[PDB]
Amino acid sequence: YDRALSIFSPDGHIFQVEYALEAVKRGTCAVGVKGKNCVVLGCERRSTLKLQDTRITPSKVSKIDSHVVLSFSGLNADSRILIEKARVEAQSHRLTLEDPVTVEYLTRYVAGVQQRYTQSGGVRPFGVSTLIAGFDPRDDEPKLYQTEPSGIYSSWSAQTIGRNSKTVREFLEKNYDRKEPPATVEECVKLTVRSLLEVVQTGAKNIEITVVKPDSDIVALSSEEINQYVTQIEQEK
Amino acid sequence: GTGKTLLARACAAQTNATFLKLAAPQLVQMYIGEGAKLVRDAFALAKEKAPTIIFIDELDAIGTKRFDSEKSGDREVQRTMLELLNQLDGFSSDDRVKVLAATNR
Amino acid sequence: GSRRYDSRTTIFSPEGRLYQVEYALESISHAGTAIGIMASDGIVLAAERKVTSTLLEQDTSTEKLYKLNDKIAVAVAGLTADAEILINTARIHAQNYLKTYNEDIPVEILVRRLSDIKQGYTQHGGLRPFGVSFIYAGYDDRYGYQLYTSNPSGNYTGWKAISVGANTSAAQTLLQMDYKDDMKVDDAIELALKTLSKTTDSSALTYDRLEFATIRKGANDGEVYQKIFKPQEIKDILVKTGIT
Amino acid sequence: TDEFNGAQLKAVTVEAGMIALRNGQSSVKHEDFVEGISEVQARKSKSVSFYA
Amino acid sequence: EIREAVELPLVQADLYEQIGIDPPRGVLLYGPPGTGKTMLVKAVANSTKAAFIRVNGSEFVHKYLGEGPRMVRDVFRLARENAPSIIFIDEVDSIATKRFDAQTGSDREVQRILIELLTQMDGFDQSTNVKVIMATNRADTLDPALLR
Amino acid sequence: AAPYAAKLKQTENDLKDIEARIKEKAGVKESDTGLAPSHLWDIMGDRQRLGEEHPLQVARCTKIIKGNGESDETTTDNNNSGNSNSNSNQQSTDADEDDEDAKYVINLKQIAKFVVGLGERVSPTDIEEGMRVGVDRSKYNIELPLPPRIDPSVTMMTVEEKPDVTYSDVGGCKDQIEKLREVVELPLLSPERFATLGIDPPKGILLYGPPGTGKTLCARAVANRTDATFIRVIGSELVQKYVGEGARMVRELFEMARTKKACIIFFDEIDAVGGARFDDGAGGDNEVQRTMLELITQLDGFDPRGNIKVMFATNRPNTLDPALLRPGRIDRKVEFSLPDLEGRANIFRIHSKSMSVERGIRWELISRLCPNSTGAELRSVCTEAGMFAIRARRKVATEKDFLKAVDKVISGYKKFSSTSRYMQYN
Amino acid sequence: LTKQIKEIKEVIELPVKHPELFESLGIAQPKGVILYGPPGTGKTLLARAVAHHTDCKFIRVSGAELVQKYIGEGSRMVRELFVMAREHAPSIIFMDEIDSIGSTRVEGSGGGDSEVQRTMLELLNQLDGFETSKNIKIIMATNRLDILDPALLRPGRIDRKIEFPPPSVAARAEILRIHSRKMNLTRGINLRKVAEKMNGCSGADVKGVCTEAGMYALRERRIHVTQEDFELAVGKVMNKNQETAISVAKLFK
Amino acid sequence: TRCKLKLLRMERIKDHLLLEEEFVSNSEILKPFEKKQEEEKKQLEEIRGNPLSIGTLEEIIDDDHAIVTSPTMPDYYVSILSFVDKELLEPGCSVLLHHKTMSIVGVLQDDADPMVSVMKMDKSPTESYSDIGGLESQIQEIKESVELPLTHPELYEEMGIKPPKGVILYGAPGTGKTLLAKAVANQTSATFLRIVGSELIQKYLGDGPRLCRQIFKVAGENAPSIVFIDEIDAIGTKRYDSNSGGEREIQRTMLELLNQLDGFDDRGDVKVIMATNKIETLDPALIRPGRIDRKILFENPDLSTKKKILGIHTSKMNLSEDVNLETLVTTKDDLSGADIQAMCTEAGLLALRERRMQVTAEDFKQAKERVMKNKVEENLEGLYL
Numbered sequence A: 001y002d003r004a005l006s007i008f009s010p011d012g013h014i015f016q017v018e019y020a021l022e023a024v025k026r027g028t029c030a031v032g033v034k035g036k037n038c039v040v041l042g043c044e045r046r047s048t049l050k051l052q053d054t055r056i057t058p059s060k061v062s063k064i065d066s067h068v069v070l071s072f073s074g075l076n077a078d079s080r081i082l083i084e085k086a087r088v089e090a091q092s093h094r095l096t097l098e099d100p101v102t103v104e105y106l107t108r109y110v111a112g113v114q115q116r117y118t119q120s121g122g123v124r125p126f127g128v129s130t131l132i133a134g135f136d137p138r139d140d141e142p143k144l145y146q147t148e149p150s151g152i153y154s155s156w157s158a159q160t161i162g163r164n165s166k167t168v169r170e171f172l173e174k175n176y177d178r179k180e181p182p183a184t185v186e187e188c189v190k191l192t193v194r195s196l197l198e199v200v201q202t203g204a205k206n207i208e209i210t211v212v213k214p215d216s217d218i219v220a221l222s223s224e225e226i227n228q229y230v231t232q233i234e235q236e237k
Numbered sequence B: 001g002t003g004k005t006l007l008a009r010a011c012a013a014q015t016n017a018t019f020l021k022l023a024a025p026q027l028v029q030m031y032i033g034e035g036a037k038l039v040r041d042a043f044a045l046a047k048e049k050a051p052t053i054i055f056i057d058e059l060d061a062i063g064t065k066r067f068d069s070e071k072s073g074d075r076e077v078q079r080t081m082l083e084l085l086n087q088l089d090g091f092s093s094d095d096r097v098k099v100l101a102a103t104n105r
Numbered sequence C: 001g002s003r004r005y006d007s008r009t010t011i012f013s014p015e016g017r018l019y020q021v022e023y024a025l026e027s028i029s030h031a032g033t034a035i036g037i038m039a040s041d042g043i044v045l046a047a048e049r050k051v052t053s054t055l056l057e058q059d060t061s062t063e064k065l066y067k068l069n070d071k072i073a074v075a076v077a078g079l080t081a082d083a084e085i086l087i088n089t090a091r092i093h094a095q096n097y098l099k100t101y102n103e104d105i106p107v108e109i110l111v112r113r114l115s116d117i118k119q120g121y122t123q124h125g126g127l128r129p130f131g132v133s134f135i136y137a138g139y140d141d142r143y144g145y146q147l148y149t150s151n152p153s154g155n156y157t158g159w160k161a162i163s164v165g166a167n168t169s170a171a172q173t174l175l176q177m178d179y180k181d182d183m184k185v186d187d188a189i190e191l192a193l194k195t196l197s198k199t200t201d202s203s204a205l206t207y208d209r210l211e212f213a214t215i216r217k218g219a220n221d222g223e224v225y226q227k228i229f230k231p232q233e234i235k236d237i238l239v240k241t242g243i244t
Numbered sequence D: 001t002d003e004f005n006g007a008q009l010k011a012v013t014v015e016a017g018m019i020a021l022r023n024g025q026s027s028v029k030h031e032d033f034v035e036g037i038s039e040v041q042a043r044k045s046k047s048v049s050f051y052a
Numbered sequence E: 001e002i003r004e005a006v007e008l009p010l011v012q013a014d015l016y017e018q019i020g021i022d023p024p025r026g027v028l029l030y031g032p033p034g035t036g037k038t039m040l041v042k043a044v045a046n047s048t049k050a051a052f053i054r055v056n057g058s059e060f061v062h063k064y065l066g067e068g069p070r071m072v073r074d075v076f077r078l079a080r081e082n083a084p085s086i087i088f089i090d091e092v093d094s095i096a097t098k099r100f101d102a103q104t105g106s107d108r109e110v111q112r113i114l115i116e117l118l119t120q121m122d123g124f125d126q127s128t129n130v131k132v133i134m135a136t137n138r139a140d141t142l143d144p145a146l147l148r
Numbered sequence F: 001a002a003p004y005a006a007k008l009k010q011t012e013n014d015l016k017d018i019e020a021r022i023k024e025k026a027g028v029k030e031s032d033t034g035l036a037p038s039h040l041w042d043i044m045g046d047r048q049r050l051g052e053e054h055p056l057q058v059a060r061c062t063k064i065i066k067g068n069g070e071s072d073e074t075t076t077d078n079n080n081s082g083n084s085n086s087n088s089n090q091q092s093t094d095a096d097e098d099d100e101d102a103k104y105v106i107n108l109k110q111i112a113k114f115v116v117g118l119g120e121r122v123s124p125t126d127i128e129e130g131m132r133v134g135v136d137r138s139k140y141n142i143e144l145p146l147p148p149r150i151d152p153s154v155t156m157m158t159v160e161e162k163p164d165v166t167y168s169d170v171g172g173c174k175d176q177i178e179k180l181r182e183v184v185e186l187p188l189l190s191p192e193r194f195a196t197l198g199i200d201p202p203k204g205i206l207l208y209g210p211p212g213t214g215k216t217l218c219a220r221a222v223a224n225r226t227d228a229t230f231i232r233v234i235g236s237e238l239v240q241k242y243v244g245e246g247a248r249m250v251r252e253l254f255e256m257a258r259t260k261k262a263c264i265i266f267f268d269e270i271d272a273v274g275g276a277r278f279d280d281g282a283g284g285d286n287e288v289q290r291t292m293l294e295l296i297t298q299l300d301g302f303d304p305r306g307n308i309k310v311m312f313a314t315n316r317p318n319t320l321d322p323a324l325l326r327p328g329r330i331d332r333k334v335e336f337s338l339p340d341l342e343g344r345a346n347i348f349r350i351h352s353k354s355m356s357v358e359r360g361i362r363w364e365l366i367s368r369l370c371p372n373s374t375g376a377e378l379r380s381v382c383t384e385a386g387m388f389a390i391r392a393r394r395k396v397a398t399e400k401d402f403l404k405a406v407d408k409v410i411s412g413y414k415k416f417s418s419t420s421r422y423m424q425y426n
Numbered sequence G: 001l002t003k004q005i006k007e008i009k010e011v012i013e014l015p016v017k018h019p020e021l022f023e024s025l026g027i028a029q030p031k032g033v034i035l036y037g038p039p040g041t042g043k044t045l046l047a048r049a050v051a052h053h054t055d056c057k058f059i060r061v062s063g064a065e066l067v068q069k070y071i072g073e074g075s076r077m078v079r080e081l082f083v084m085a086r087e088h089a090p091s092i093i094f095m096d097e098i099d100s101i102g103s104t105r106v107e108g109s110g111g112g113d114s115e116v117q118r119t120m121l122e123l124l125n126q127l128d129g130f131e132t133s134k135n136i137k138i139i140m141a142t143n144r145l146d147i148l149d150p151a152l153l154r155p156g157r158i159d160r161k162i163e164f165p166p167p168s169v170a171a172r173a174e175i176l177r178i179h180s181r182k183m184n185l186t187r188g189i190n191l192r193k194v195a196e197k198m199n200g201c202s203g204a205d206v207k208g209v210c211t212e213a214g215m216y217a218l219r220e221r222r223i224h225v226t227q228e229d230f231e232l233a234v235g236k237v238m239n240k241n242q243e244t245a246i247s248v249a250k251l252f253k
Numbered sequence H: 001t002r003c004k005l006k007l008l009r010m011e012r013i014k015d016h017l018l019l020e021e022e023f024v025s026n027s028e029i030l031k032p033f034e035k036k037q038e039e040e041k042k043q044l045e046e047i048r049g050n051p052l053s054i055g056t057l058e059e060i061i062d063d064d065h066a067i068v069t070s071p072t073m074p075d076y077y078v079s080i081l082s083f084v085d086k087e088l089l090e091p092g093c094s095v096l097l098h099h100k101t102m103s104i105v106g107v108l109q110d111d112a113d114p115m116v117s118v119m120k121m122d123k124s125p126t127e128s129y130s131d132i133g134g135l136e137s138q139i140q141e142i143k144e145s146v147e148l149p150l151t152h153p154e155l156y157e158e159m160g161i162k163p164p165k166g167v168i169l170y171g172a173p174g175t176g177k178t179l180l181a182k183a184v185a186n187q188t189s190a191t192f193l194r195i196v197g198s199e200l201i202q203k204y205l206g207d208g209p210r211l212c213r214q215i216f217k218v219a220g221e222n223a224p225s226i227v228f229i230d231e232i233d234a235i236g237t238k239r240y241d242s243n244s245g246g247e248r249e250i251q252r253t254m255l256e257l258l259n260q261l262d263g264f265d266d267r268g269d270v271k272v273i274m275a276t277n278k279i280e281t282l283d284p285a286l287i288r289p290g291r292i293d294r295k296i297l298f299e300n301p302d303l304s305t306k307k308k309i310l311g312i313h314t315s316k317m318n319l320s321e322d323v324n325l326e327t328l329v330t331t332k333d334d335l336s337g338a339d340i341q342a343m344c345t346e347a348g349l350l351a352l353r354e355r356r357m358q359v360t361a362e363d364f365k366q367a368k369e370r371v372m373k374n375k376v377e378e379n380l381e382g383l384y385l
């Protein structure tokens, strides 16, 4: 094939990018807040449909390395195409220059993939938007980036993407303070959980939280831990 | 824009005979075959006032003959056109009636 | 001009969305019903043929049950021609992972590979999708029996029980009211016949319109045995459950 | 005039004079007549400096 | 089939009443052109030796307005008098048209005819006459109000 | 029930009197005017009725026949043996007249033709052929020539009563406005400048551009300014049911324009009746093009057309057939495009001058924030800037109300932008 | 096909007869009723028959504009029909998707008689308001439910979808006896055996076996319908029905 | 009693005195003549005679003469007499003609058509605001658009804005697009002309521009007016194949519809409500800013908003204390507001077959099952997990 499927618009755009942005909104919702020493990406997980497994059904947040986690919102099918490249580039980094990836670098590469599919003949661009997070190796500053279909990436102190991202981000302007992150890791879990129960609702059976602490600690919380934070917050409120 | 209409207007002034100006959508008429009455009378008139020149402007309002499909057709256009041909035939005058026809299709 | 006759199968709509993947799923709702239930001692796979005739050989047909490898068989619902290709790909890939690692391929690996293949066609090439829906029954040591559905979008989701094809809404609702966590293959055999009985468009459900296979760990020496039941045992087990 | 019809060429005559009319001139000038070719033509958004 | 439709009701009315079956009333002849539709009716016109009228669908259109309906009443009245009678409308295509613009006078006059024939066909019921036989080489052009 | 019962009887009694006043008024005797000129008008109609100025049947001339010198009397004619120079001493006992100067061939509307004579309020010079004429219903004779054509009735109710929408409101002081004037306002207002030169001025404008650039705005603006006949026909209205009726609409339009001194016919939106001619075997494009081709021939004549300036306004100059767009029927194409930053600024100020605005409003900042916008979007911006004041309980606008406005109108309705699809033709 | 008689009775006959139960429940007034199945099931027959028992006008709409000269068009038939219905109320508008008369009208729209259905249905919601309650129910007759469009199959639009199968052997014997209540028989004719012989597929065909048998009573000059007349009937009508199905030929030329 | 009494006292003296005043004034009018008033009545009859022949005014000639077309076919150059005015005659108007010598003697006629009544409604909807189960803010964006400038034009001139024209009510099926339109149609009490978009394609060709232009003519007279255009989607999606003008014809109907919606007319106040199911199918010019100012969207109800839909609909019903209203919302997810209204009805219907007025929890669960099977959901979401 060789025909353009991305073409210039008489306005100033490409219609496939605006369209792709519309695609991220019709997806499920992932939230990002970083603490003083943690990233937390939590995601809304479906359960309209029932008899769905929990062990074998893939999660919304897929560990690339031992220190770089990626979450995605938009088409759940497409997602796996951006991640397959992203994992192999991380092993190539280890090979050719040594040291594992820096979060800034992986975000720039992932951006370059979506960038390319906005301008190469015979592709549409990805309808999928990432929160790519993690730690730099031998450092402990939390890093939280979000890249989007344009092929543009932005760093964010806290961010949210997917359905009702404007509604959630409004919440986060009013409770997360740029100057003083949540004082500990635990305060940071209560913030991501506090945000989700606005839009997601319908029990703690939908809320997923992955927490990363520096020095290669990836833990994904159990349904019991989630219930516990939702309950506290419901009651206090 | 190449002055086919110009050359006819000229021709009118030069021959000093009866010049019957005609516009092809004027001829089509919504009363059944009164469009045809218009063909025969205009040409009947041209026998009298002989020698003559009929100048027709357009010819895509006597359109074309290609319709045969069950759903509609327009056989109002065809009839007034087939009447035009019977006046050009041998039983009518044609040796004292010239027809000047001008079209851009 | 060539560009003049291009469909553009693979742009988005204004909704953010892929007309041709949506339509593909539309046509699989026409196709034959297939249901899979993962018991805790097997997986029962059962699918009802979309066509039937009495001159039609239906005794050695296996146009809905296809074995990918020794431990993973799938049920098919959609464009059978498109499926025959990817079944034969799958069979190449499953055998390949065994050749190079000398290890039984996990259910997860084969299912994800097939998904990404569908995924390549909605992503690029200017080609129509492969409209296939697979239900994968598979065994691995690691996670036991694993159950899975894949769509033409090239996305995979786990199940414990699921139904694709015609009458999806109807079948799905029925499974849920009955399904318990403590079920063995016997309860599963009964439910699979039974949901199919409620979605059926024949005046009574019969064996010649049923294809039926199981995978049991209750086969000897703690081994998984794939059994595609013959139509004469299906007719037998149909007398047991008292459907006919 | 290149692929003008004799109606287009009549158009350049009138157009020329209108441009004189604005200037307030009592004759049509040679400068104005050419200016009228360019006005009869649709392209009159002219340079944008992507022809330099 | 056509002898039992047309000829038989007249010669033996008594049998239909006995068995208790509805006798065939109006006859419609459909089939492509060039099958001998009209010729089969020619045969019964000699054979019955009853009255047999003659009439075309263009006997019932006229230059003056509403003088179509006045003919419709005339052919029935004549048939009733010299009953049992067969009326044949050769081509009934232009009366039984299935569409009307219903703003032109040409069409309004056929509207009036079509209701007038249909009404008095019910008037022609329970008579010694066998009702109107009519033919059309077309059959997708007819209003289904006749065909019920 | 005494307190309410007694008084209820009285209320009914009061209803009786209100009715009697009514029955007296309409019979002795309802007004139509003031009262007095409806009495006299009854005595005025008695005067008209005694006269036979009515009933006069309306008929029409088909052919002027000459009644003297044509051998109308055939007393010496037998084939061609007649003089054709006398019907006054041909074979007459008199020298003087015995027939009239002019006979004429009338056709009645019921259909019956009569050969009529010559009236006494008329001369042969006032009688034209095709002209509608009153004949006397006592004895058919032409009395009075009566304005021809009974056809205006859907070309007579589309002549405008002047709507007032300012020439100012049309955005900016653009070249695009001034181009209208070269064609319309100026040769009519002062033909003196063009006269010295001896230049016969242009006549055709094509306003073309995408939805909402103010083509229509401009239309209304020259309706009130020009002060000559403005006949605006919507061009979808040219389609009719019966084929050759549709051409008749626009054909009668030109008869009408031509009769009146100084016209501007404003053909609005000829995407309908403008389709390029093609052969398709289904039916042909015959009904659409019948009307279009009538038009074309009367935009150049086979004779000179009168003073008729014609304005075409379209959204797509690409559905239009090639014949219309060449000069000499559309002399000048006048191009309308989305404005720039200064352009967008003027239109905002032209909307905002009737609004309550603080002095803190810097329109430069919010025009910049609106890009690739129609003057019609910038209107929706102004309306929605006040709607947010109405919602907030504020009465005087803020910069803040215009920011809210710009985000909702521009971001939200960019999905629904006409600009994108329609630009492809423009 | 008795079960079906009882289902249409609930939705159509009962609310016109007494609005008082529907008030008590507070249930949102009935609307459209879709009848669907192959031909000759008597979906049309049941509509007329409900209309008789309820005692309501039966307004047949052909999807022809011909018979009307007082609308003369489909572009106001909607609302002009509702003026006439309100006068002659209660009414049951009957409208049938024929799907072989209006052949090309169906294509790309789900029915040009479902253009009729939807337009009249939109009226109906306000009719429950004009001055209390509905007096117009609408019954829609369709051959298929798959040639129906999705916007009339949605809930809160309709309120009932009655399905009709073709006859069973038991059902058949009943349908056959109705046509037999109007003509001659002779002792020794078992209606049961004629149900077996008949394979049928319409209740229409059943009525054709009775008329056709009466016509052989004429042929042989019998005085009553004999059993042998049924043997000649069944064969002839079947050969005629199956020929046109399998040759896919119509009555249209 | 005395509340009635003060009105009795004002109303009697003022009105009865006026009645007396008319009686004297007919007589006084008589005097300069000898009988003016009672003779104007005898003259009117005399002038007009009997019969009066109806004609149709063909064209009006400015000289107090007119060309009237009797439908019997002779045309006439008549005079215009008393009891008429020449701006009360417009081309098309019916005239009353003197039989002996034709003259326009009047037109007191109603001149009403059944063609206009099709456009109009006769109405008292069941639909009122707060039968809307939630989405309160959306009500107070629609009410700010349609209903509010009739109540107060004062706000909009005080601000100096032009009052917003046109609304497009779009979203998914079952989000109550028709339910809002009728709830506001009840409150406003402005002449609410209704027209369904499908009637705008006919069986003729060219009748399109003619029908569309007739809507807005009625709408214009009866100002202020609402013109509600229900599912203007149907004309773009479904071609019925009854129109001989084809795809071409439908496109032309669109174009007259653009001018009649705004254009050059400077007609009355006409709010337009346009229900549609997809706004990506309607012609972009048709929907473009400054002729459709405000565009409201509805999307599917929430867990709490479904509770509101249920209270308003279960309220009419007779109920048991076994009914747990709340468990009918938790079981039902991602279902419309249309489904909840059909669910109450379906429960009551099962309860009408059992021959009791009660509605039990079991008739509700039974009803809940059956309505959920019938909806066959989206393939829009089959991409996603």
Ligand SMILES: Nc1ncnc2c1ncn2[C@@H]1O[C@H](COP(=O)(O)OP(=O)(O)OP(=O)(O)O)[C@@H](O)[C@H]1O
Residues within 6 Å of the ligand: B001, B002, B003, B004, B005, B006, B102, B103, B104, D005, D006, D007, D008, D010, F300, F323, F328
């Ligand atoms: N060769 C020429 N010499 C002089 N003037 C010309 C010449 N050709 C065209 N013109 C001028 O251009 C004007 C417009 O062209 P005209 O309408 O006569 O053209 P045509 O090709 O017969 O068109 P159509 O088929 O579109 O009716 C003429 O009226 C004439 O004044």
Ligand SMILES: Nc1ncnc2c1ncn2[C@@H]1O[C@H](COP(=O)(O)OP(=O)(O)OP(=O)(O)O)[C@@H](O)[C@H]1O
Residues within 6 Å of the ligand: E032, E033, E034, E035, E036, E037, E038, E039, E040, E136, E137
């Ligand atoms: N079976 C037949 N035997 C002999 N001649 C026949 C037969 N069938 C038809 N023909 C011949 O064909 C002729 C034409 O047939 P006829 O006019 O009866 O046709 P039709 O099908 O009713 O068509 P139309 O509508 O064109 O009149 C007959 O006059 C006759 O000569």
Ligand SMILES: Nc1ncnc2c1ncn2[C@@H]1O[C@H](COP(=O)(O)OP(=O)(O)OP(=O)(O)O)[C@@H](O)[C@H]1O
Residues within 6 Å of the ligand: F169, F170, F171, F172, F210, F211, F212, F213, F214, F215, F216, F217, F218, F315, F347, F374, F375, F376, F377, F379, H258, H262, H263, H285, H290
């Ligand atoms: N240039 C402008 N300056 C100010 N207001 C503008 C401008 N252009 C348009 N408008 C506003 O937008 C309204 C709608 O645009 P208008 O109908 O005049 O335009 P058009 O380009 O002929 O559109 P269409 O053919 O799509 O109907 C005008 O009535 C006016 O209120």
Ligand SMILES: Nc1ncnc2c1ncn2[C@@H]1O[C@H](COP(=O)(O)OP(=O)(O)OP(=O)(O)O)[C@@H](O)[C@H]1O
Residues within 6 Å of the ligand: G151, G154, G156, H131, H132, H133, H134, H135, H172, H173, H174, H175, H176, H177, H178, H179, H180, H275, H277, H301, H309, H336, H337, H338, H339, H341
């Ligand atoms: N949000 C809502 N709150 C309350 N009732 C609602 C709501 N949504 C739907 N309904 C109920 O469902 C009924 C049917 O919906 P309605 O006909 O108003 O829908 P619509 O969105 O215009 O759909 P379509 O375009 O498919 O006709 C209403 O009469 C009302 O009783």
Ligand SMILES: Nc1ncnc2c1ncn2[C@@H]1O[C@H](COP(=O)(O)OP(=O)(O)O)[C@@H](O)[C@H]1O
Residues within 6 Å of the ligand: G001, G038, G039, G040, G041, G042, G043, G044, G045, G046, G141, G175, G176, G178, G203, G204, G207
């Ligand atoms: N169920 C039945 N029992 C008896 N007669 C029947 C039955 N169904 C149909 N008929 C007969 O067949 C005729 C034609 O059927 P009709 O009601 O018009 O059919 P449909 O809409 O099913 O095509 C009926 O008028 C009736 O005489």
Ligand SMILES: [Mg+2]
Residues within 6 Å of the ligand: E090, E091, E137
């Ligand atoms: Mg014939």
Ligand SMILES: [Mg+2]
Residues within 6 Å of the ligand: F215, F216, F269
């Ligand atoms: Mg416009």
Ligand SMILES: [Mg+2]
Residues within 6 Å of the ligand: B057, B058, F296, F297
């Ligand atoms: Mg020409």
Ligand SMILES: [Mg+2]
Residues within 6 Å of the ligand: G096, G097, G098, G141, G142, G143, G144
């Ligand atoms: Mg049907």
Ligand SMILES: [Mg+2]
Residues within 6 Å of the ligand: H177, H178, H230, H231, H275
């Ligand atoms: Mg609706």
